[PDB]
Structure formats: structure tokens, C-alpha cells
Design a protein around this ligand. Sequence first.
Ligand SMILES: [Mg+2]
Ligand SMILES: [Mg+2]
Length: 476
Amino acid sequence: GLIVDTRDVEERVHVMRKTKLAPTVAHGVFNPEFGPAALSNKDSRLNEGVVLDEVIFSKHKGDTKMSAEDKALFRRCAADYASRLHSVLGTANAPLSIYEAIKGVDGLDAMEPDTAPGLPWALQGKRRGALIDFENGTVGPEVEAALKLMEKREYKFACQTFLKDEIRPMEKVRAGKTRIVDVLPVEHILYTRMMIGRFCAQMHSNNGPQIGSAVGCNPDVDWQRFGTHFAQYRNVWDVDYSAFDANHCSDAMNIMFEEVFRTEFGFHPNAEWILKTLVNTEHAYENKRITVEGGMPSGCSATSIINTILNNIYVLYALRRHYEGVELDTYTMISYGDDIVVASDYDLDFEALKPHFKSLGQTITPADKSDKGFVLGHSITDVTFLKRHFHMDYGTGFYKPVMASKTLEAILSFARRGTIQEKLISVAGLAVHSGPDEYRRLFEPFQGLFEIPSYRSLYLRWVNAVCGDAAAAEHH
Ligand SMILES: [Mg+2]
Ligand SMILES: [Mg+2]
């Protein structure tokens, strides 16, 4: 987005310095070109002259203003996608109760009891457990009061900037490209869930190419569903954005919120309002208060959904701005936030769509190098989605989500202290699709030190998960 104002204030907002990630026994074996991101300016493995503060906020270069003709086209595309979206999901989008927003419903997980409250509760030394009761699903005196200000549409807030403690490629570690988590006030998260949580639960349950959303999918079981769908198209594209959510211009965001979250689709009028508060935001980093116009904060309860919705509208927009007579059935797509796979039987020229995406402030490049740009004739077994390839399991004839071995090596190389055994069981479920030989090699350093699930047990778990009938018929 656009940094419009930078102010220095009395209160200092401390950020999480020093990593919680420590190397494992696997690190010495795989030696990954990876490591924990820089969390302080004094971290010795940074490049010289790199000021972490200017780099973590360098992603704000934009807020691209759209022309009147482009804005009207964006509205038609947002209306057309919303029309499809609410045709599949339905119009049961009434506000969640305070109780249901905290405890969750079917398709929507419960709110995290101790994960940071936001501002100004962090300055006041209050944790989430003090402001809200999470077992009984009730609210304290201040959250209750903040909800009133939101109903009246006068509520204001600040986003708390957190440095994301995560494994990053060493090249990005040295460059100081630490990602940030924009922590929003817990009451704002509560209210957003109240306003659109019902909608969110319905998208999770109805995930798939029809609504263009993979949010809430289970890759183990769903890769067969997604794989078989995209396999019947002549052309498949793996499209990468550079800084997707940072570059959502305010014009795109505003029109989207207006078209998708209308009262005529069963929404409370404040659904549009609360979402619109994400457009122009104030961010608190140490002593600095940075006002940003445009872009999406990662702290909102529905960031993945919003990004996914925008991703769908963007593709419809860029195709309509280039070709004539483009409709929703001209192509098919699946997205999870910025991650995207597009397919069509038409020989669509994705290379010429570049300046049409640029009009939204977004930069599209092919995932597979700069192969003289975008090319035709690629299939779903050539693309990547959610860091997983589409490979055929020769024993069942089902598509399986296969992660690159280098990524699995990197994931197994670091862990938070005391979580290593739990992490191994989790990663084993990801690594089983790499085959028995590769699965064995990845977990060799942990042998004797931790329980490692047998390849066999995880394969048999997968077969039943993807198709119960197939596992049942196996015992013919
Ligand atoms: Mg939460
Ligand atoms: Mg947190």
C-alpha cells in the first residue's frame, strides 16, 4: 500500500526479538539453505547497511489508483463472482452470536485463548484470557463496550506489528526480508467473525474449483478431487504474484466489499463496514506509528478468504480487460490467498495479461522460471499449489500431494524446543507421499531418538481418508 504518515509517539511497542526455533539433529545431515528469519537489527548474519525496519515496511510502494473505466469493470467482475459465490453457498449469512464467534461453529474453528490481544491491551499488560472467557463464551466489560462502538460505526484501532518467527531461505534471511504479522485487536477479530463467520464457515465446507477457493481444504483427501478436475483442461497455468496482499489497492478492496457483502445476500450492514476498516490502517512498531492506505493486514480472521476472493475477481478482470465475451465458464481456477492455479481449453495468452494485472497494482510471473514468459500446454502434473505437486499414486490411481524433498529437509531441520516429537508425526503425514525410499531417508536422522510412524501405517491411513470404498474393496 501507501505509507501516508509516519509519527513518533511516547508509548513503545516491543516486538519479539530472538528466535524460538532451534536446529534439530536433521540440520547437520541435510544442511539446508534455510534458517530462522532476522528478528533484531543486531542479528549477526544480516547483510551490512540493512535496517530491518525499512525492509519489513519496504513492501509498501503502491496503492494503485484505478481509472473510472477500470473501476466499473472491476465492479461487474466482483458482482459476477459474488453471484456465483452466493449461488453455491446460499444467503444464510446472519451475524454469529457472541458465544458462537468465540467457540466457533461447524467449518469455523474456535478463537485462540492465548495468542496476543492486540492494542491497546498489550500496553495495558492484559492477555486475551482476561478480556474474554473462552470456555463459557462470554465477554468482559471492555470488549463488550468496544462492540457497541462498532455497531455505531465509530470504532477506531491500531494494528500491532509482529515479526514472524519462521524458517526462511538464507538469501531472504540475509536480506532482512522478515515477514510481519499485523495483529489486530481481539474485539475486532471477534466482531469480524460475528459479521462474516457464517459466510466463512460456508466457504470452508464448499471449497473447490466451482467457487475458486481451496480455503479449508484437506490436501490429503482433496488433491484427488482437484487433480481430476484440472486434468481435463488443455492449458494449465501456475501463476505467482509478488507481494499479493500488500498490493491490493483501495479501489479494488472497497468495490469487492461492496459487491460481495451486501445485505441482499443476507449480511448485516456492518459486515461491509468492518471489512472496510482494513483498507486504511495505523500500524504500531516500537516508537513509530505508520499510517498505510491500501493493502491487507494478515491479522484479520478472514485474510485468506478475502485474498482468495480478490484473486478470483482479479483473473476475471484481467481476462475481460483483454478478451471480449469472457465469462466465469471461459476458465476454471483454484486459489488459496495468493496461491493460484488457472486452467482453460482456450489458448489464453497469460503473457499479455501482465499489464492488465499491473492496472490493479499486481505483478504476475510464471512459477517455472522466466521460461520466455507464460507458455501453453502445461498440465496439472507440472504445477505447484500449497507447496505441493500433483503426482499420481500408482498403487491407487489417486492424485497425492507431493512436497519437494528440499522443503521437507528444511522443515525437519528446525523446531521449537520441546515440540520436536509432535512436529515429526505431523511432517510424516506430508512426507509419506514422497515414496517409501524418500520417506525413509528424511527421517533417518531421528531414528532411535524419536518415534517415527511407519511408512505403511501412514499410507493405509491415507487410502481410507481419500476413498473409504477403495480401502474397503482392497479386502475383496
Ligand atoms: Mg483468533
Ligand atoms: Mg500471536
